[PDB]
Amino acid sequence: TNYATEAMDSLKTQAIDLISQTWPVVTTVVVAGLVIRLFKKFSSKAV
Amino acid sequence: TNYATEAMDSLKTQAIDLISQTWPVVTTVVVAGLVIRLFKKFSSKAV
Amino acid sequence: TNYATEAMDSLKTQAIDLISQTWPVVTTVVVAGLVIRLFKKFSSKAV
Amino acid sequence: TNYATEAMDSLKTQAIDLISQTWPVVTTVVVAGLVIRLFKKFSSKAV
Amino acid sequence: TNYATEAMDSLKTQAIDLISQTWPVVTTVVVAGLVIRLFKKFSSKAV
Amino acid sequence: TNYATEAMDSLKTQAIDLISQTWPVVTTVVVAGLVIRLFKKFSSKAV
Amino acid sequence: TNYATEAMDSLKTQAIDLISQTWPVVTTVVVAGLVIRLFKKFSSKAV
Amino acid sequence: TNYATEAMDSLKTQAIDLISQTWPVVTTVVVAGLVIRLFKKFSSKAV
Amino acid sequence: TNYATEAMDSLKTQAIDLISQTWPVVTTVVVAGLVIRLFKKFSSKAV
Amino acid sequence: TNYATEAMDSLKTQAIDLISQTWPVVTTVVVAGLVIRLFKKFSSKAV
Amino acid sequence: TNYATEAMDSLKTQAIDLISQTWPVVTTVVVAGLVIRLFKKFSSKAV
Amino acid sequence: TNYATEAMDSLKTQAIDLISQTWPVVTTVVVAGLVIRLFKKFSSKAV
Amino acid sequence: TNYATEAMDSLKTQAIDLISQTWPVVTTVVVAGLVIRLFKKFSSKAV
Amino acid sequence: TNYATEAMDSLKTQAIDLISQTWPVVTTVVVAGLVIRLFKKFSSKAV
Amino acid sequence: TNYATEAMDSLKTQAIDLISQTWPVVTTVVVAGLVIRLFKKFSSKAV
Amino acid sequence: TNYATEAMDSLKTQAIDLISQTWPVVTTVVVAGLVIRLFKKFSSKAV
Amino acid sequence: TNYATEAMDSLKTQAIDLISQTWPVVTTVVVAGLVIRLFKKFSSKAV
Amino acid sequence: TNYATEAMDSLKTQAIDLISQTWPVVTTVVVAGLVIRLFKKFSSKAV
Amino acid sequence: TNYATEAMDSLKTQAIDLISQTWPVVTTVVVAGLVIRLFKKFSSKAV
Amino acid sequence: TNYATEAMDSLKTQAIDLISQTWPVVTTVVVAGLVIRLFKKFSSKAV
Amino acid sequence: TNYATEAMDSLKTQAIDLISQTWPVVTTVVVAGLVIRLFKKFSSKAV
Amino acid sequence: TNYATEAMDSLKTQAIDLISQTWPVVTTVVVAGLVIRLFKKFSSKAV
Amino acid sequence: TNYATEAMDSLKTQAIDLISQTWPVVTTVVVAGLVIRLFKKFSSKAV
Amino acid sequence: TNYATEAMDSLKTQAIDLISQTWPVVTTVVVAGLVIRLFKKFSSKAV
Amino acid sequence: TNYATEAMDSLKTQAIDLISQTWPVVTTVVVAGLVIRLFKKFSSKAV
Amino acid sequence: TNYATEAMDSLKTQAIDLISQTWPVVTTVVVAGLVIRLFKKFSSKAV
Amino acid sequence: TNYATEAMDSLKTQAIDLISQTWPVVTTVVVAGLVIRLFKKFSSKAV
Amino acid sequence: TNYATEAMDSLKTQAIDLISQTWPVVTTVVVAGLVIRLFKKFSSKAV
Amino acid sequence: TNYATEAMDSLKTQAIDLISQTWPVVTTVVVAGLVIRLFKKFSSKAV
Amino acid sequence: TNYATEAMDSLKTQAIDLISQTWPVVTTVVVAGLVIRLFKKFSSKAV
């Protein structure tokens, strides 16, 4: 409609901004959970 | 009639304006009830 | 007669004007009794 | 008689013209009292 | 009669025009009350 | 009598033609008042 | 008439004032019956 | 006559004044019997 | 007349006092029949 | 009757055509509401 | 009227007091139905 | 009817456009909820 | 109407304030339910 | 008398034949006014 | 009587044929309104 | 009845054929959703 | 009298036979109007 | 009465046969809707 | 007189016996017209 | 009277027997409409 | 008079005894028509 | 006259006492016919 | 009047006592129909 | 009245005994529907 | 009542037998769904 | 009212006591469902 | 009942056959997933 | 209530006995699943 | 039906194409998640 | 509102106190589940 398609476009613009907002948290959790593993791995390799 | 068809046209112009008045409430309830769900979903995905 | 048919024509012109006078009350009661129902219906649809 | 049967024929021609004069009032009262009911019925059906 | 059958034909032509006048209100109430439901349904499906 | 039984037969032939004249209005009001209900019922079933 | 049309105008001015008097009760019942539903809905969304 | 037509004119002037005297009672009974019905109708609509 | 118009004025003053006497019963029946309905409605809303 | 049974046959032919008209909407709502669920299910299976 | 508008004001003052009386029950049911859910949620988070 | 089948065709053309409007939101939520999972999976595979 | 559109605007201003009131509870439940999970995750990473 | 009792017997034989002539009109009015009501009743039962 | 009992037997034979005429419409509305529900139920069971 | 029990037998023969029609979809969704899981399981076992 | 009491006894024997003639129509209308309702009720219970 | 109690016994014998006719549909819908669930449950248990 | 008072006593003894003769017809019409209504009422209550 | 109070006692003894005749139909409809619901409820609980 | 006022007192003592005779039928119809409704209501509440 | 005006005054004093004698019967019939209706109304409201 | 206003005051004092008599039944039906619902709700919350 | 208040007290004593009769069914359905759920819950906890 | 309490006792004896009939299905589904899990657990422990 | 607000206060005092009665069941189910999990967790930690 | 207990016995005989049908899949998945592990274990022991 | 609080106490005494019945199964599964692990651990330590 | 079986065939042809569309993603995720593991395994074997 | 925002503030003050109550359990489970791991790690380092 005039309304329903406008509503879905509003919802999609909510969702895309929400996803682009979630990705920094995903990187700073996953990458920091892997550096803390690489450190253990190469520290054990170092000795 | 002169009256009855005029009455139905008055009623239809009442109803269409009422529906176009109700759709903003429907969008701002449904979309805000879905963003509050997408936030939970992608927040759980973020960890 | 000269009188009786004139009397019936007077009566018919009374009655038609009376009916055309009653129809605005009928519209403003019935339509206002239906908008007050459409409002309940679409308000319940809105939530 | 020459008079009494002529009187009854005069009376019958009065009465038939009176009845044919009354029927338009009957239609414009009854039909307008039923359209004002059909309008209520189908207006309630419309919502 | 000459009158009564003419009266019923007048009444039927009133009623059929009244029904064909009521159907647009029925469509614009029912269909707009169902699109407002499909929107909720597929919006919940969208998340 | 010669007259009274003829009068009742005239009245019965008035009445039967009047009833057979009323039945089309009854069908086109009742059936159109039920299709307008079946439409609501199966439209709600459709969603 | 001088009287009957004046009577219908009196009746219409009674009815319109009565309808405009009824609408505040309709709003304060329906809207308060919907806020009490939105509260349940978004409270369940909040957890 | 000099008397009989004067008598009928006296009678007509009695009757017209009597009718114009009766119409206020008719309005204040009928309109007050309809406001007491509109109140019930729109009060039931209000809830 | 001296009498008939006085009689109609007596009748009107009877009728108006009777109507103003009936309205308290109408309010205390209708309003108490609606509070007993609002209580059911909002009690069901309360749970 | 000649009329009533004809009326019921008219009503039945209205209703059957209405049902056969409603079934495409039912399929295109239900099947599209299930493909949108199978997609989620097998997409989660895909990872 | 003097009566009908007074009746609607009485009804509105009934209804508003009834709604303000219902809201404590709504809070003490909904909030106690959500604390009993938060307890389950954070108790499962605690282990 | 002339109206009811036209109403169902209007409803179906509403619904199909609504579904084709909902599918982009479904893809951009589901696919973005799976890439955010593949990233975690292959990031853990990467170390 | 003068009333119905005013009623919907009142309802919308109720609803938007209610949603903006619910979002702090949603953040302080969801974020506190995720920090309590990140703590477990990175505490297990810490050893 | 020879005459008066013969007159009453003539009158009674007039009246009984008149009543037996009236009963078909009574059946074809009443029964046709009830079938037209049963049709409405069971048609509403049919939907 | 000779007439009244014959009239009631005519009325009963009208009514029984009318009921046996209404039952096909009842089956083809109710059963088609239940298959359209079983389809939704078992389609949701199918996924 | 002659009709109602026949209607229920028609409904049961609709339903049983519908269930026997739904079971192939259930098998080809569930079994294909489990082979796609066994493949992952034994592929991880294979390395 | 010899006549009047005999007339009332004739009238009572007319009336009792008429009532015992009306009761089969009452049963076959009411019971068939209730089986057509029980069928709808238990058919909806069946699904 | 002779009639009314016989009518209620007829109605009860209609109803009991209708219920005993509905129970096979209830079993073949409910049990087939549960086997289709047990299959999913134990199929997921099987892997 | 010797005659007139005797005549009135004869008339009163006619009238009292006539009234006591009419009351059985009144009971068997009214009570049978109410049982036929109670049956409809409680039959509708029974379903 | 001798008659009227006897008539009311006859009517009351009709009515009480009618009510005690209706209660078995009420139990065998309501209880059988609830066992058919308990079966669905506990069958869903069983899986 | 000596007679007319005595007649009205006789009539009033007839009427009051008749009303006090009618009230048991009113209670045993209305209360038994409400217990048969409370049973349905709380039986549906019981499941 | 000396007599005729005295006769009319006697008649008026008969009539006024008769009317004041009739009003208690009118109240105890009408009010008892309305309490028996209010009881039904509010008893149905009570459930 | 002396009588009519006294009659309305009698009627109002009947009605107010009747309403104050009905309210205990309304509370003990509605509140007991809601505690039986709160018990189900919080019992399901308890597990 | 002597009757109406006695009728309401009879009705209240019917209703309270009916409610106290319904509560055992409510407990033995709800508690047995929750033990059958606790068993599933703690059986899954047991493994 | 004599009937309503007997009806509730019938309903309770239906329900208790139904629950005692459902518990074997619950045990043979839950226990067989847990042995199939213990087998996996201790089979993995066995290697 | 005197009654309705008293009814809501009765209902609230029912509900609060019911909630304070439900919380011990919630604690003894949830805490015992978590100790049975902590035991598994720390028993696996113990080896 | 005659039906409900027969329905539960049908359901139990469905379920037991379904479980005895699922166990071969469970053995041929679990045992083949353990032989593929014993082979790795004893192959590593072999060197 | 007298019933609802008694029902919750019955439910709590069901649940506590059920939990105290489940704990032996939990110990004899978990402890036997850990001794079978300690045996592997210290057997590998033994060589 | 003509529709329902056609709907299930449409749904099955949706589902099979969806599954055959999902399998390439499953292979390119699982196989690429195993080559990335074989590389680690045989690279550690290579030194 | 005056109530709804107060309700959300009550809910938030419930939730924050609940979270601050849960954190000690989280620390004393997680930290004690990590010291029991550090002990194993450094005990194996000690030999």
Swiss-Prot record, chains A, B, C, D, E, F, G, H, I, J, K, L, M, N, O, P, Q, R, S, T, U, V, W, X, Y, Z, AA, AB, AC, AD:
Transmembrane segments: 20-39
Compartments where located: Virion; Host membrane
Claim: Thylakoid is one of the keywords in the record: no
Membrane topology, Cytoplasmic segments: 40-47
An example Gene Ontology CC term for this record: helical viral capsid
Membrane topology recorded in Swiss-Prot or TrEMBL: Single-pass type I membrane protein
Functional note: Self assembles to form a helical capsid wrapping up the viral genomic DNA. The capsid displays a filamentous structure with a length of 760-1950 nm and a width of 6-8 nm. The virion assembly and budding take place at the host inner membrane.
Family to which the UniProt record says this protein belongs: Belongs to the inovirus capsid protein family.
Protein name per its UniProtKB record: Capsid protein G8P
Biological source species: Salmonella phage IKe
Gene: VIII
